[PDB]
Amino acid sequence: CPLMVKVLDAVRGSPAINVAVHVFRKAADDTWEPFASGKTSESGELHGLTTEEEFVEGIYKVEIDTKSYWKALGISPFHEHAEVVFTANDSGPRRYTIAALLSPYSYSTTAVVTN
Amino acid sequence: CPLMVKVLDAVRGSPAINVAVHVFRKAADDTWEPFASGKTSESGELHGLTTEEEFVEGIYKVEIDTKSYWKALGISPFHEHAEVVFTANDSGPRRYTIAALLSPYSYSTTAVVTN
Amino acid sequence: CPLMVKVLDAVRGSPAINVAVHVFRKAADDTWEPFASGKTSESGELHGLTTEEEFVEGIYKVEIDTKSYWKALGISPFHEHAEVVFTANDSGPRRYTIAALLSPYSYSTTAVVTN
Amino acid sequence: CPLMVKVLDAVRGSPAINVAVHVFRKAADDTWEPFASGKTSESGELHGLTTEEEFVEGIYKVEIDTKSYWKALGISPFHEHAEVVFTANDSGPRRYTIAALLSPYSYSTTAVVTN
Ligand SMILES: O=Cc1ccc(Oc2ccc(Cl)cc2Cl)c(O)c1
Ligand SMILES: O=Cc1ccc(Oc2ccc(Cl)cc2Cl)c(O)c1
């Protein structure tokens, strides 16, 4: 697991469960191509997006479908989604955890790069 | 205006109006003594807490009464309050803005320090 | 001034000065077209991006060029940029402030929306 | 483990390792009494602070010694510490994770209350 996503809900003080997550990789023509996707588990985590073999250096976009998440709780959101865009590069052995904390009108995202 | 406090609501995407804020200063005897207090305005800002004469070097604690804010809005939040503790004016007089962003189970705080 | 952008530096506790910001608007053909751009001032704020006449209903993306900011400061950050995507003016014209707080491996963004 | 603390570093994009954490419980005379303490592990987590038997309802303060953490990395911090004050109450089975994301001049803390 070189790439993991973890989402928390700042209103309910809980993991954000069942949030759809789509990952894209930037192609040579500068369009985003689908790479990996899933929905966060009961722990608010999404594992198994990719493998070391398929997660080569390049530019990736992780889109967290926050608007749908809030609407399924009856709560009015501001953003369409939360987007995390970064260059993945091999400087050594490396796991990337993209973390996100959601409020209806605010979010934070952090990268935890380990090993 | 060497010390200003600004509070925003991450649920509503609005300034957090009428938030009580108490500032304390650590005394000679290691005790937290009352320094200044007030309530945020409609802009979510609290001005005029102190003057450059009375805001001497020291360790200060800005307590933002987040629980009272949320309960006045029918939300039962996690935290009693947000506390922000820092040494001030240790390299001469500066201007300090203490910002806080509030959600029911979460907050962030940042300090913007100028001159 | 229906759209304003404010950026702060969480490492230095200061406004994030000279940050490039590009705003796009989703077109009829589902494409991101250029809407407006600018650079933050010494207060970390970007004013005059648009006018109430030209800021119509639509889906907007505010891209904050965080990587360029950090690299100009000798820091090699994680993110390419901060992207903030939202529907605007769907319930009539409002005033939008998009705030961002930046660290090398992290950012938060909140929207304050008035009238 | 009813009470866990997890700390991340937003500058280094990594867990915050070896951060001292002191927990207090409010006594009847309104003073804070030491309750539990430790230092975050290589994962930035601190487990085993307490037990279900000893973590009764009451008001607790979790102080994260952020200033020492930053100084041991050569980086100038603003806060003395990060403080999280909350009422622990039994509404059902409940684990509390106090999470914190640190920057030199900013921090966020969230409560994740599960089970
Ligand atoms: O973006 C801000 C942010 C994102 C996530 C957070 O909680 C975690 C995030 C990642 C990991 Cl590995 C562990 C924890 Cl507890 C957090 O406190 C702040
Ligand atoms: O995530 C975005 C964000 C934006 C602002 C914040 O507090 C402030 C910090 C500096 C200034 Cl000038 C104004 C404010 Cl409201 C903050 O804590 C987070």
Residue numbers in the entry:
A (entry chain A), B (entry chain B), C (entry chain B), D (entry chain A): 10 to 124
What does the paper say about this structure?
Transthyretin (TTR) is a homotetrameric serum and cerebrospinal fluid protein that transports thyroxine (T4) and retinol by binding to retinol binding protein. Rate-limiting tetramer dissociation and rapid monomer misfolding and disassembly of TTR lead to amyloid fibril formation in different tissues causing various amyloid diseases. In the quaternary structure, the TTR monomers are arranged into dimer-of-dimers configuration and form a β-sheet rich, homotetrameric structure. X-ray studies of TTR show two funnel-shaped binding sites for T4, each defined by a dimer-dimer interface.
The compound C2 binds in forward mode by orienting its aldehyde and alcohol substituted aryl ring in the inner binding pocket. Ligand C2 has better fit inside AC site than the BD site. Besides, making polar interactions with the amide nitrogen and carbonyl oxygen of Thr118-Thr118′ and Thr119-Thr119′, the oxygen atom of the aldehyde group also makes two hydrogen bonds with the side chain oxygen atoms, Oγ and Oγ1 of Ser117-Ser117′ and Thr119-Thr119′, respectively, in AC dimer. However, in second T4 site the same aldehyde oxygen atom make only single hydrogen bond with the hydroxyl oxygen (Oγ) of Ser117-Ser117′. The hydrophobic and van der Waals contacts are fewer in BD dimer as compared to the AC dimer. As a consequence of changed conformation in BD site the ligand make several hydrophobic and van der Waals contacts with aryl ring in the outer binding pocket with Lys15-Lys15′ and Leu17-Leu17′. Side chains of Lys15-Lys15′ also make polar contacts with the substituted chlorine atom in the BD site only. In this complex two water molecules are also present between the Ser117 and Ser117′ in AC and BD dimer facilitating direct hydrogen bond with the side chain oxygen atom of Ser117 in all subunits. The negative cooperativity is further apparent by disordered electron density of the ligand in BD site. The substitution of 3-hydroxyl in triclosan with polar groups such as aldehyde (as in the case of C2) increases the propensity for polar interactions with either Lys15-Lys15′ or Ser117-Ser117′.
